[PDB]
Amino acid sequence: QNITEEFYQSTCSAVSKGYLSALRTGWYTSVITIELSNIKENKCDAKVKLIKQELDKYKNAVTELQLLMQSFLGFLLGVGSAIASGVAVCKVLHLEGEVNKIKSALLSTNKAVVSLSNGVSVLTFKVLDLKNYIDKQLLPILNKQSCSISNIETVIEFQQKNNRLLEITREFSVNAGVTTPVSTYMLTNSELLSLINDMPITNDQKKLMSNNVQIVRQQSYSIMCIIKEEVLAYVVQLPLYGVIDTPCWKLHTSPLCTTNTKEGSNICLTRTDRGWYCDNAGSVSFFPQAETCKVQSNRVFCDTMNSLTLPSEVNLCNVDIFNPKYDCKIMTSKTDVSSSVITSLGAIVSCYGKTKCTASNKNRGIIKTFSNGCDYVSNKGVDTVSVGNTLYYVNKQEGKSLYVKGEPIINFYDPLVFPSDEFDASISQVNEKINQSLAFIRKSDELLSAIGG
Amino acid sequence: QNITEEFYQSTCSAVSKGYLSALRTGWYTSVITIELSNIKENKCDAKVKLIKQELDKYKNAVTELQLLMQSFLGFLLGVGSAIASGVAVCKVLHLEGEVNKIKSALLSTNKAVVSLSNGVSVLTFKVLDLKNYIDKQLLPILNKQSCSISNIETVIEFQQKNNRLLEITREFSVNAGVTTPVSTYMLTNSELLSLINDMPITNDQKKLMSNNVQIVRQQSYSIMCIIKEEVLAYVVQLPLYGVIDTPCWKLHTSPLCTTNTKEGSNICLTRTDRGWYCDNAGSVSFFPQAETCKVQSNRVFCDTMNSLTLPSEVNLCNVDIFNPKYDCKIMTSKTDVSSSVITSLGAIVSCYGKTKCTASNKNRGIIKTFSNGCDYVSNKGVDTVSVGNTLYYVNKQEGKSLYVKGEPIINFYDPLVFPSDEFDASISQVNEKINQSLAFIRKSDELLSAIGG
Amino acid sequence: QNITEEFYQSTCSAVSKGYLSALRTGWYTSVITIELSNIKENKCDAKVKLIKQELDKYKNAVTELQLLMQSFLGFLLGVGSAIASGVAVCKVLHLEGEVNKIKSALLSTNKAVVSLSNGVSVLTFKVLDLKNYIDKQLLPILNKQSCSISNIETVIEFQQKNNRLLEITREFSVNAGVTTPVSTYMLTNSELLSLINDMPITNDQKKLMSNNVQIVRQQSYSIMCIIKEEVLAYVVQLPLYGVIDTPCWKLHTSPLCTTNTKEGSNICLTRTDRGWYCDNAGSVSFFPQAETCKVQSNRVFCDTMNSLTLPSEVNLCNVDIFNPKYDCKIMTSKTDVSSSVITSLGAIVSCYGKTKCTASNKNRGIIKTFSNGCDYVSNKGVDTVSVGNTLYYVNKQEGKSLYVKGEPIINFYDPLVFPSDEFDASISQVNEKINQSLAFIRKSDELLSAIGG
Ligand SMILES: NC(=O)N1CCC(CC(=O)N2CCC([C@H]3c4ncc(Br)cc4CCc4cc(Cl)cc(Br)c43)CC2)CC1
Ligand SMILES: [Ca+2]
Ligand SMILES: [Ca+2]
Ligand SMILES: [Ca+2]
C-alpha cells in the first residue's frame, strides 16, 4: 500500500519502509494419518491384471515406508534444530498405544484433538482411507466375480485413490522422510485451510495463514513418522506467526569509496548491517540474509531463527552513522570495484574507476550517466541500470523515494591511518584503530623533539 | 573441441582455456495462457462419478490459483532483483482490458504478439484449452445422455487434458507462484522451441538456445500472474544471451605454503581470483563462484548478475603475478592444511605436513607420491588423486596440459614481517604492509644509533 | 543407542559422542538401460486416438532425450568434480560397439556385468522394456483390428508402461541431464536394493546401504548418457562407504565474551573448529559444515569431499585448548551479540548485554534465567530455549550430558593488547600477536628509561 524509500548519499545505503511483519516465532505440530489395508497375498483377465499391478504398487509403497520408518552478518546467527519439535512429537507416537489412540479418535471423524501420553494435545487429521477401499470395495468385487473386474472404472478408481500414497512415498523416499515445502500431496489446500481453522491461534493469525497458504507451505515441514496397525502417520510442523503487523524496514548497502585518479590510492567503507528489520517486543529482530525472508506485497515473512535481537537504537545508523547511542557496523577495504544494489524502489550504484555506469528507460534508452562514487536512482522513469557489462532490471513497485544528499563519510578519513582490512568492524572500532595509529606517531615525534639536545 | 590447461608452480594456480561464452545479459518475457471453463454447479453412474471427481480436481486447481494470485570473491558482487522484469510485465496484465486483449489476439491462433497499454509488445502463447473441452465436449455429452458417460474414454480424455493444469497448480503451490527451472508442464519442449523461434534475437542466438533448451530452462522463471475472464496467465521470463562465442577461461587456485619442518613456522598465500572469465565488450566478465556457471562441452553458460566487470589486464596475473598494470588478488594465512583442486584437465595438490598425497591409475594404482608443497598432475594417465583421507576423481575430458615450472612466490617473503591474516588483500596491499613493518624497524634502529652518545 | 555430551564452560563449546561413521569415500558407477521401440510413422476410434496421443508422448520423450544427449572452516576445503567418475564411464559408452555390447548382455537377463573397451567392468541393469511392448504387444493389435482397440485396458496398460520414461525425461529436462537425489523413477527401491546386493562391497556395506536406501539416494547421481540403437542409457553413480563404524563426534561452538557493564569494553573468542569429526585410517576426517552430514539415529553419513584430514591430536582442543601438541583454531572479535547453539543433547546459550535469555519446560514454563556469559542446559527437563526474540526447540534424543565447569578463557586475556579482529586465527597466532604488542611496549619503555639522562 504505502512503501517509501530513502537513499543516504553519505553512507551509500538505502532504507525501505512501510512493510508489515509476519514472523515465524514458534511451531505447531499436527499428526496426519492414512488408513492402510493390511493385505499380503491375493487370490487371483485384463482388468484383474491391472488391479493386481496396482496392488503391487500399493504393497511396495507400504514396504518402502516401513523401511523408511526405522532405517553480511549471517555468521553472527545462532544455530537451531528446525524439526526438533516435530521429531519430539513423532518419538511419542512410537510409544505403546499411541497409534491405537489416534485410530480410535479418528474412527468416525476426519479430524480430532488427541492427548498424547506426555500431556501434549495435538490436532490429528486422517486424509485418506485405503483400508476401507481395498478391503470393503475392491477385494469383495474380486471374490463375487471369481477374478473378474468387468467394470474398467474399478481400475481407474483404485488408481486415483492409490496415487496420493505413491506420491507421498516418492517424496519421503528422495528426502529421507523430511520434506519442505509441504506439498499438496502431504496436505491439500483444503486440509491446510481446515488445519489453520482449528489451530489454537487468533483470528488475525488464521486470516494471515489462510491468505498466505503458499508461504505457510514454504515455512512448514512434513516428517515421516510411523507405519503400523494399518496406520501411516506423518507430522506436519506448521509455523506460528506470533509477531504480526509490526513495522519492517529493509536496509540496502553498497561500497562507498573515494574517487581519486591515482590507482591504489582509494579507501572504502560499506555498512555491513544490510538486511530486514522488524519491530518485535520492544527490540528489533534483524535478519542479515534478507533473501531468507519472503515478501508478498507489503508483508514480510521472516523466521526468528535467522535473526539477531538488537536494541531499537540500531535504526539511528540510518539517521546519523556517527551517533553515540549505537555503534554502527561497517567493513573497510581498498577494493573499489563497481556494482549496483537493486532496492525496493530504485537502485544504488557504486561506480569506480573507468567503469561505464548508466540508468535507462524503455522509451528513451540511457537517461543518466553516473559519475564516480555512490549515487542512486528511483524506479520512476528508470527501468534498468547497467554497471559495466551487468544489466539489472529495477523493481517497478509503486512508491515514493527521497534522496538525502550528503558528503561521503569516507572523505573524512585520513587514508594514511585508515584501517583498511576490517570486516567485523564498527564506527568505534575503526576510530579506536585510527587513535592507536595517531598515538604511535605522537610518541615517536615526542621522542624526536626530546632527542634534539 | 580444443581445451588446454596451464599450471603455474610459482602461484599454485591453473588456467583452462578454449571455452566459448554464452552469457545471460538480459531477459525476454512472454505471457503463457490457459483457457478455463467458468463452471460452478453441475447437474449430475460409475463413469459420471469419475467425471465429477475430475471436475472437482479442476475446480479446486482454479480456486487455488485464484488465492495464489492476490494472496572466493562473491562478496564483491552487486545485488539484483532476478524477476523484476517478469513481475513488471505481470503488473501490466492486471490493468483493465489487458487480459481481454490477449484473449482476443489468441482467439484463433496459439501464438500472437500483443502490445500492452505501456507500449511493450510481448509474445503471448496459449498452451491449453480446457474451456472448449469442458463446455463444448464434456458438458453436452452429460446432458444428451441424462447423466450417463457410457464411453470410459471420455473419463481418460478429460484426465489427460486436466493433468497439465493440476501439475502447474501443484508447482506454483509449493513455490509461491515463482518456479525455476521452468518445467515441461509450464512450457513443453516444442513450446519453448517455438518461443525461441519467434523471439526478437539473431539466428546464432536461436541456434544456441534451441541446442541448449535444458540450460535455457535452468536460467528461466515462470511467474504466476493472473486468473480471470476464463484465462489463466503466467509470465515465462527467458534468458537473452547477448554475449556469445567470446573466449572464456577458468582459473583454479590452491594454497601455496612454505614447507619448513618447524611446526607453526610456515606462511601461506592463495590467489583469491579463482572463477570463470569471459571476454565481453572490451572488458572481462569475472564470475567468482564458477559453480554458478554451467559447462556443456566447450560452452560456458554464465549470468552477468554473478559477475564483476574487470579490465582485461586481470589476465596478466596468470602471466606474472608481480606485473605493474594490474594488482593481483591474494589472501594470506598460516593455515597449511592439505587439499586438492580438481581442474578441467588435471589436479592441483597442496600437500603439507605429514599428509599422504598421491595420484593413481585404474590399471597400476599409485603412480606418484607428492612431496610437500603445491604440485600438479594432468588427467593423462591419472584417474584419481588422494589427499589424506579424501579421494577425488579427475575429469577425463581430452585436452593438452602444460606444467610451467617456477619457484613458489611464498619463498620470497620474509616470514618475520609477513602480513599473515589478510583476506581481501592484493600483491600491492601485502607489499605496503611489509614496507610499514620494515620502516618501523628502520626508525627504531635509527634511534638506537643516535642514542649511542 | 549411547549418545553422550560434554559442555566446556571455559571455551563455550560442547562435544557429542557415541556416533558411528558411514563416510562416502568413493563411487561405484552402474549403467541403467531402457529398451526403446524405433517407431516413426503410424498407420492409423476413441481408443485408437488415445493410443496415438500416448505414442506422441513416447516419441517426444525419445526426441527430447536425443537433444539432451548431444546438446566456519569450509573455506579451507578442496574442490572436487562430483560426477567426474560417472561422466568418464558415460564417455566410454559413446565409443563404437559399447551400446550393442550392453544390449547383447542384457538380451535375456535384466542385470549383467559388462566389460567396457577400457577394461572397466560395470554392473548394467535394464529397468524397462518399451521395445517389446510397443512393437510386439501394441502395434500388432492395431493391425489385426484395422485401427480398432476395443479393450480400453490396452490404453491404460500403455499409459502405465510409458509413464516411467516420461518421468525420467521430465527429470533430466529440468536438471540438464544430471539429477540428485536419485529418484524412484531413475531406480526403484527394489532395483537399488538389487544393485547394492550385486555391488563388489562387503556384507556390512551391503547391510548399511540396504538399511539406509534413502541416504544412498541422496548421495547418488543419475547422469543422462546416450540414446541410440533402441537403447536409452543413464549412469547411476552410487556412494562407496569405505569407512564404517568408526567413532564420530560433533563439536558445537558459540561466542565467549567478557561481561563488563561498560559498552564497547568487551572482548570475544569463539572456537572455529565446529563440525563433525570421525576417526579414519589413523587420522580424523573433519567436516566443517556439519549440515552437509546426515544423521540417522547414532549413524552419521558424511562425504570425504567435504572434509579435512587432521591429526587425531585435534581432539586435545576439547581436553585443554592451551595444549602444546595441537594449535587450536579460534576467531576473535568485540561483537558480543546474543545467540544459542542447539546441540545433540542440549543448548549452549551466549547471553550478552541487556538480552533476555531463558530455558523453558512445556509443563512449568520458564525454569532458568541465564546470566550474562556463556552457559548450557541439557534437554532433560528443558523443551525450548529463548534468546531475545528467538525461540529454539531443543532436540529430545535420550542421552547423558555433563557440565564441565571452568573459568571463561577470555578472562585471561589483556583487553588492551587483544588482537580482536582475527578470523583464521589459532591459540598460538593470538599469543604471537599479543607478544609483539607487549614487546613494542617493552622497547618503548626501555627507551624512556635510557632517555632519563
Ligand atoms: N572475517 C571475519 O571475522 N569473519 C567472521 C566469520 C565469517 C564466517 C565465514 O566463514 N565467512 C567466510 C566469508 C566472510 C569472511 C571470510 N570468508 C572467507 C575467508 Br577464507 C576469510 C574470511 C575472513 C574475513 C572476511 C573479509 C572480507 Cl573483506 C569478506 C569476507 Br566474506 C570475510 C564471512 C563469512 C567470516 C568473516
Ligand atoms: Ca535483472
Ligand atoms: Ca570424486
Ligand atoms: Ca525450533
Numbering used by the authors:
A (entry chain F), B (entry chain F), C (entry chain F): 26 to 69, 73 to 99, 137 to 518
Task: Give sentences from the paper.
Respiratory syncytial virus (RSV) is a common cause of acute lower respiratory tract infection in infants, older adults and the immunocompromised. A human monoclonal antibody (palivizumab) targeting the fusion protein has been used as prophylaxis to prevent infection of children at high risk of severe RSV infection (e.g., preterm neonates). We select lonafarnib, a licensed farnesyltransferase inhibitor, and phase III candidate for hepatitis delta virus (HDV) therapy, for further follow-up. Collectively, this work provides an overview of RSV drug repurposing candidates and establishes lonafarnib as a bona fide fusion protein inhibitor.
